[model samples]
Target chain A: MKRLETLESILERLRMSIKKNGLKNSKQREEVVSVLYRSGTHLSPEEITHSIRQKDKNTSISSVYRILNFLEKENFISVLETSKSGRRYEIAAKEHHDHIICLHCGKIIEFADPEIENRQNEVVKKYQAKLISHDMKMFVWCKECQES
Target chain B: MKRLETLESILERLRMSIKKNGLKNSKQREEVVSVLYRSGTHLSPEEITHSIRQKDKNTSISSVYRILNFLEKENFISVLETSKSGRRYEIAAKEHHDHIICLHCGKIIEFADPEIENRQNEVVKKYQAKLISHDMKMFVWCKECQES
Candidate 1:
């Protein structure tokens, strides 16, 4: 069973990191991380801004973009590139899962297979590379897509 | 050991696919494949054009781009996206290998791990998805990078 970290714990870590870097914390940055943290699916910056607008309708896209960049540089976020679709962002604070895409509809499915993830880590260790991160994607026609 | 298809075999496959689809045969398209087929490294379109110009100095980027699209539509090539770099292309006529990157210096390394590849395929089968393709990449500091 994959256990995602609690939102409480995630915010706590963010607090500690922000203080350690001598950076004044902004609620907007926290909101960006919170938006991505709760989302199991990858989110686009535009979608992220929409979510931000739910609370603070005045939040500018530039503000969200700036905060997103800061969080990413601080290692709080990760980005995935799709062939036809644009880059999607996600939280990097949890055990990662690979993505499956429905080619016909652009549907995204997330899967966490123990064997596959373990093997990738092992493969990198075999080469003594100091593994930082990995991303895997499988493109497919999902059952629903197949039916359609 | 993995077997990459011979250039002769690949060209024959391309010939058959073009004929079956009623698309006219193209030597320039074949040259694009030939350039990618022989190169184990992924290539940017500019790098591809450079190689194409080696034999035929008159080839243009627009022509190369057009042939690349045609060949890709016919399923002769694949594209991989990188974070800082632009799209890099590879021939899909081979048993694929995953990539490892040296984060410090941007060096690319290729590794073929049967267990990892096989497990990815097996994981997708559990969902009954019709798999189209998979790409995996690991970002790391290679040994030399670690030393440097």
Candidate 2:
């Protein structure tokens, strides 16, 4: 609902910003953003490259990295530092949801519960510190991944 | 407190493990451990290296990295993927607490409350995923830091 709306707006902003900044408008950015926007799961640069190559094998890996950083800096995507395989990226405009990462297969599932979120805020407040933001990622081998 | 006892035991276990694993019992390791254990702060490897050199100018940066990885592997400390910083490490033996990191001095203060911790565990349960662990770090530019 809100997340979808935010996602669309963020994409629009990114497109406008790129033009304003006089950055190159390339297929790589479009392809990367398309693959990312369409896919609900978290993605690494390699995953994007793999998908991009599956469409057009000529796409370079460096282009994926560059575009990925560009998107992150522009706040179109959020980078998870816990993404040890490579920086994991999620659409930044989406509603607040934490990741349940499949450690083995690198699958990511989005989950959001108001109760969990409330308690987290409470914890931050109990300490008398201003709560700016926090990240909660669950690392586990998912059912399919575990069986494999 | 039980936490104090746990801290000592954690150190003892690390020393034993390092000796058993045939790791060199070097001064850098000693200094790194001392800085973390004494400063009572969660620190990144870079911070550890910087602080260690202030006291002992010859410590290798690689040693800080090596020692942190070593501690993390042995469960002597936990690595947190937090903020925009590289990685944060905390002594794992203490009663679990999360970070309220000072943006200015990089001072990290730890605070834990049983009531809040209980709520966190419940959140994990509600999600139907086994709660392995969670990381919650609050970034703060404190009053002093802001004035400075």
Candidate 3:
């Protein structure tokens, strides 16, 4: 199931979300989604808009944000909130993972642990609440940062 | 040890940070820290400024943010980023825990898991990085929201 959730499948999910929400489909939206799908790391809206302009110089930042909001509403993308800079966006279909960010250089490392997930489930269950999703971010000094 | 980290101690730490950075201390900064210390939940800058006005009526929004930034830089406060609204701030001296936020109502539940922390340590060790800190946030529907 996880193996099948590639960009192609996620694009299909995006199509379904658009149709279900009765939203209009546009080439710009597709281009924006394509950028998110291809990028290995999460991107901020500024980053998304920049990437889009590299391909389509006429693209507006406002439209990029609008498409981003639509995609987020449809669960096609997830937002990663950082303290230093600002918010970042990523595809929603990827496997569940947490982040380890370097305080000095802003480097992000992704890791997943079933044990942590299970423990999280237990904690949420204790609150008598159903678990929906989680985001874990660690701030660390990378080897280079420590050396310097 | 955790219980011993009183507001006075936090203020002492703040004083040290101000001195270390060669920054001046003022009444507004003290008021801002007081508000964070008293509040049980995290607050955005807007919320903090509002709270300060209720007491002093002369506090400025810019000063609230400036103090918040100083406190965060000094590790006296932590920021919790939310997808729905803006970021929230909390006292960092409290016990280490992750958050479970209700998507429907925006309520936050904080819980600690030693098992999860241990696994996180292992992940950091794998990267050969020194672990300075971490932030974990979980999104969910609370029992009331789930029932609704």
Candidate 4:
């Protein structure tokens, strides 16, 4: 699922979180968050740094990695680990959706199944529990990877 | 889903894996594995050591934690993190099942949906991917917590 919040709104939240945590104002951190948040997709650090450098040519891969680590820990972003391609990042503000990842090619595909989601509620009800949230990752072999 | 293998069969596999890694025969490690494997539930390290001591009478929490680290790294077990609890461990050998954890009560409830599994396959097919495996965690508020 894509983030419903606009870039400005997200940056505003980032600034608020930074102030709340007493972190220094870091432009590079904002840039990395902007890159991941605006792209509306999952990205490896390399891909993110490549995108960040398109605007801020001074940005470094190490900087991107550090920013990602901080952002992920602070709940500004989410991460998915892929066996073939290492780790990938996406904005955490998106609506709930499960991923179908390509095990070999490292593709992260997203889907939201309402029926299954409803089933999830029913299943939780069996134990008299109220569902709050969930995370699911499905690793697969993409057709591109299989065909190649 | 539960593991289909017998205790003797799993022990054999464990022995083979330990020998393959050139590790010494660690009795405490074997006991901890036995404690988790023989049970049909997720256990914290405290519970694990408690069970181990019932037989060995010498197992320590530190030792159980160490053994869990080794076993987890070796894919001999799996972990589920809950909001109320630090983390819980289970046998990775169990057939695929997702967990619904109580956010306040720290209960781990497992369920496997055949229709959802089938839908997972269908979802992956849309992306031209062959479904491999998945990990899912649903956080909830159980009835016990609601009444108390």
Candidate 5:
């Protein structure tokens, strides 16, 4: 999907979540999720904070965290809590996928592996636990940096 | 290895870490790691706190978190970061094992599957991810619980 088109869907989801939870439609929350949806990669709170302020000077770091947590609980975005940086958020999807993280630039590439995901699901089924979701990240020295 | 034996070795590592990190080697740290080692299951910070403080009134929640991080960084314990109830810590080893968590009691049973572990290592190495480690947990209602 083209970037803008993808973001419109995320915005809709964000709207639904706010309405479903009876949350106030703060201008700051809208701006923060917009920045997150357009990021094209998992983003740090600092990155979200910076991007939002660049577009609207009034956003606060606290609002970014609150909305991130809000979206996280509603399963709108997956929090890559493994990152040393404050949680990195990725747009959510029904299908399972893995991530290739650029160790240098912090770029993210998401890919779905049926074999791995299926096997993990099988493992979860073997235990009889309701397998709701999972997270996987692969850190890589991307080719761009590998050459340098 | 038997459970208590693992606890002894892990305790030794904890002492070494305490000295290395300049943290207090209070009985709380000892009791925390001890309960964690013999737990034969994953444990949360709150659970660890409750367990250790019951025995050692001096144990502080801050100290529990600090030791958990220290043990995680030093490879003495595994932090299951994907968990929703805070972080769950398990013992670290070469065995390619995942966890089966009991839904009723939060009991974690660790079982390593050589086949899965081997293939995952190949996958990680393919990406030059260093194949350092992984975390996988399968939630379940256990057999005993099923019978009940």
Candidate 6:
């Protein structure tokens, strides 16, 4: 089984990075991170805000956006772009993988392939390019949707 | 050598699709496609509007967006997502390829590999997914950016 990072460890690293960067410590940011880690799936800002407000209505939508932006810039989260639907965010520190999205129901499935990664490295070397990161998303019809 | 589709043929197909879909036939839409083909690179809507206005100032920003949305829906173009920079548009029928983006200068390099495509197929089969389409973009520092 693929070993996933514990939520406690992820939170500790985030807190340390926050202190290192001299960013203002806020409960709202912590709530956002906690909600993201607990959710364990890609979420939009509005979805995160909605989920957070269920526990604490004091978290403003703007604050959610601000924190999400901060987290994305700080490499705590990754953005998944849909063809037409707005982008979604997922935790970054977890294992690397690509997404498979359902076109009809808009479900996302994550998977990783070593062969694909090796080919990507070969392509980058072929171009004499320095690698930073990559995004790969496949659109599909999930089994449930296909059967319906 | 890969033979790219001719601009004339691309436009002809776009016109046919537009007519079939009962979309408005206008010079503004044609200008957008013309500029996209001429530039031969991924461009944002703002860039498309700016290019159109240089020759003819009648194309409004709103019209550019409207046409782009229509083009995307009608399968005439595709949108490329950047991490920070907003989405970019590229012609769809040119060829099947993925993008490698320069993080520093926001340059996009396109490449196609049969091996990667095969690997993606295996992944979808492993997941029992009904494949529709996919998007892959790699972030990199291009040679010039790396040397700087």
**Estimated TM-score per prediction?**
0.42, 0.46, 0.44, 0.47, 0.41, 0.45
Ranking by TM-score: 4, 2, 6, 3, 1, 5
Candidate 5 yields a Cα-based lDDT of: 0.67
Cα lDDT tens digits for candidate 5, A1-148: 2343466676787787566434663566677666655554678778778887887776776556656656665666666743444357766643455778877777677798878878988999898987787767788888988888
Ranked by lDDT from best down, the candidates are: 4, 6, 1, 3, 2, 5
Give me candidate 4's TM-score against the actual structure. Answer: 0.47
Q: Model 2 reaches what TM-score against the true structure? A: 0.46
Best by lDDT: 4
Alpha-carbon shift of residue A144 in model 5 (angstroms): 2.4
- For all the candidates, what are their Cα RMSDs to the real structure? 16.0, 14.1, 15.5, 15.1, 13.7, 14.9
- Docking quality tier of candidate 4? incorrect
Query: For residue A15, what is the lDDT in candidate 6?
Result: 86
Q: Mind giving the per-residue lDDT tens digits that candidate 1 earns over A1-148?
A: 2336776777888887665433456798788998898887888789999999999989887777656655675667877665543557888776767889777776778888989877888998899976777778998999997887
Clashing pairs in 1: none
**B1-148, model 3: which lDDT tens digit per residue?**
2433689988887776555443465677777787888888878788889888887788777667656756765577887876634567888778778998887787888888889888989999999997888878888989999888
lDDT of 4 by residue, A69-93 (tens): 6687667888886643367889888
Displacement of residue B147 (Cα, Å) in model 2 is 41
Give the Cα error of residue A45 in candidate 1, in Å.
1.5
Instruction: State each model's CA lDDT, in order.
Output: 0.75, 0.69, 0.74, 0.78, 0.67, 0.76
Residue A26, model 1: lDDT of: 77
Candidate scoring better on lDDT of 4 and 6 = 4
Q: How does residue A50 of candidate 5 score in lDDT?
A: 88
Q: Please list the residue runs of candidate 1 whose C-alpha ends up more than 4 Å from where it truly belongs after superposition.
A: A1-4, A19-24, A114-133, B1-148
Looking at model 3 chain A, which ten-residue stretch has the lowest summed lDDT?
A17-26
Kindly give the stretch of ten consecutive residues in candidate 4 chain B with the minimal lDDT sum: B16-25
Query: Candidate 6: DockQ?
Result: 0.02
Cα lDDT tens digits for candidate 5, B1-148: 4442456767787787565433454676576666766665667788888887776788777667756655565667767743344357766643456777777766667788888889988898888886777777788889898898
Residue A148 displacement in candidate 3 (angstroms)? 36
lDDT per residue for candidate 2 within B1-148, as digits (tens), equals 2345444565677677655543455666656665676656667777888998897788777657656756665666677765543577766656767777776676667777788788988888899877777777788887788887
